[PDB]
């Protein structure tokens, strides 16, 4: 909600399924999802840094936190996403932009700033924001794909908050991840 | 006046510009649509490279025109 | 559409489109050459990762 990932999520929806669309309300919900995940991972990573007595946060600390928060299936896929993002970043030779060098739709540079702003750690690495950024993009795409399946079941091409909530409740894996998060309830 | 900009991937985007509009201005617009740096983008008309400092009128481009997109590679 | 003029227009437009694409391809290749790194054969697919995937079925 604090950031503006509505445009970014829209791009993901186009690549994952041009036919299916997303409502402006649904986009806003996705924005809050990114903020919620960032806070949980950030706090968990900070705790790990203290245990290792390392002021600078790196991909290793994030990797442990990612597995603990994400179920078994999601955790395995998450490793490839963050690892590849770091490799791609390292692979690129000419590139002055962090996001461009990493090849991530989400603002990689912004993520790095958020970690430092959160006062979680005195110093933040480059491979860390890239790793986290890759995980966030994966979650965004996964939610959109599941929502599309529910939309088809309801004979609707557009994705609405009802579809998003239905998809999360349709799979225990996401339910566990969002167990402490409520999309919208009285 | 409107023009169509196609890319080597096979994608096409409609763009509204006037004969007096500069290429540099178009580069920024493309960045908004793709999210790719304007320096790393090349615009071609009738298979001819286009200069940023030059205007559309310079290449004698009329209404309904097709422009192709290429990628610039430089280490800055 | 009995006249179907779109087909005639597509043929003419395609010839001009390919002309620009071919020239554009040369510029893309030349720019990559400057990097000093040239590949003989490259091919890869970039798509969003999913929990489940079925290789069988082609597409």
Curated annotation (Swiss-Prot), chain A:
Modified residues (N6-glutaryllysine): 176
Residues bearing PTM N6-(beta-hydroxybutyryl)lysine: 94, 117, 176
Gene Ontology biological process terms in this record: chromatin organization; heterochromatin formation; negative regulation of cell population proliferation; protein localization to CENP-A containing chromatin
Modification N6-succinyllysine occurs at: 176
One annotated GO molecular function: structural constituent of chromatin
Positions bearing N5-methylglutamine: 185
Post-translational modification N6-crotonyllysine, affected residues: 117
Keywords, sorted A to Z: Acetylation, Chromosome, Citrullination, DNA-binding, Hydroxylation, Isopeptide bond, Methylation, Nucleosome core, Nucleus, Phosphoprotein, Ubl conjugation
CC per GO annotation: CENP-A containing nucleosome; extracellular exosome; nucleosome; nucleus
Modified sites of kind N6-(2-hydroxyisobutyryl)lysine: 117, 155-156, 176
Subcellular location: Nucleus; Chromosome
Sites of the Glycyl lysine isopeptide (Lys-Gly) (interchain with G-Cter in ubiquitin) crosslink: 94, 96
PTM description: It is involved in the initiation of both imprinted and random X inactivation. Ubiquitinated H2A is enriched in inactive X chromosome chromatin. Ubiquitination of H2A functions downstream of methylation of 'Lys-27' of histone H3 (H3K27me). H2AK119Ub by RNF2/RING2 can also be induced by ultraviolet and may be involved in DNA repair.
Subunit structure: The nucleosome is a histone octamer containing two molecules each of H2A, H2B, H3 and H4 assembled in one H3-H4 heterotetramer and two H2A-H2B heterodimers. The octamer wraps approximately 147 bp of DNA.
Annotated family: Belongs to the histone H2A family.
Function in brief: Core component of nucleosome. Nucleosomes wrap and compact DNA into chromatin, limiting DNA accessibility to the cellular machineries which require DNA as a template. Histones thereby play a central role in transcription regulation, DNA repair, DNA replication and chromosomal stability. DNA accessibility is regulated via a complex set of post-translational modifications of histones, also called histone code, and nucleosome remodeling.
The protein's name: Histone H2A type 1-B/E
Organism encoding this protein: Homo sapiens (Human)
From Swiss-Prot, chain B:
Swiss-Prot/TrEMBL site (Interacts with activating enzyme) positions: 54, 72
Consequence the record notes for mutating residue 72 to G: No effect on ADP-ribosylation
Cross-link Glycyl lysine isopeptide (Gly-Lys) (interchain with K-? in acceptor proteins) placement: 76
Effect of residue 63 to R: Abolishes HLTF-mediated polyubiquitination of PCNA
Modified residues (Phosphoserine): 65
(Microbial infection) ADP-ribosylthreonine modified-residue sites: 66
Annotated ranges, domain Ubiquitin-like: 1-76
Site residues (Essential for function), renumbered to this chain: 68
UniProt modified residues of type ADP-ribosylglycine: 76
Compartments where found: Cytoplasm; Nucleus; Mitochondrion outer membrane
Protein function: Exists either covalently attached to another protein, or free (unanchored). When covalently bound, it is conjugated to target proteins via an isopeptide bond either as a monomer (monoubiquitin), a polymer linked via different Lys residues of the ubiquitin (polyubiquitin chains) or a linear polymer linked via the initiator Met of the ubiquitin (linear polyubiquitin chains).
Protein known as: Ubiquitin
Range covered out of full length: 1 to 76 of 229
Curated annotation (Swiss-Prot), chain C:
Sequence motif MIU motif, location on chain: 16-33
Parent sequence residues shown: 653 to 708 of 708
Family per similarity comment: Belongs to the RNF169 family.
Protein name: E3 ubiquitin-protein ligase RNF169
Domain notes: The MIU motif (motif interacting with ubiquitin) mediates the interaction with both 'Lys-48'- and 'Lys-63'-linked ubiquitin chains. The UMI motif also mediates interaction with ubiquitin. The specificity for different types of ubiquitin is mediated by juxtaposition of ubiquitin-binding motifs (MIU and UMI motifs) with LR motifs (LRMs).
Physiological role: Probable E3 ubiquitin-protein ligase that acts as a regulator of double-strand breaks (DSBs) repair following DNA damage. Functions in a non-canonical fashion to harness RNF168-mediated protein recruitment to DSB-containing chromatin, thereby contributing to regulation of DSB repair pathway utilization.
Motif LR motif per record, residues: 40-52
Subcellular location(s) of the protein: Chromosome; Nucleus, Nucleoplasm
Effect of residue 42 to A: Impairs recruitment to DSBs
Gene: RNF169
Residues the record lists as Phosphoserine modifications: 44
Superkingdom of origin organism: Eukaryota
Subunit and interaction comment: Interacts with DYRK1B.
Transmembrane segments: none
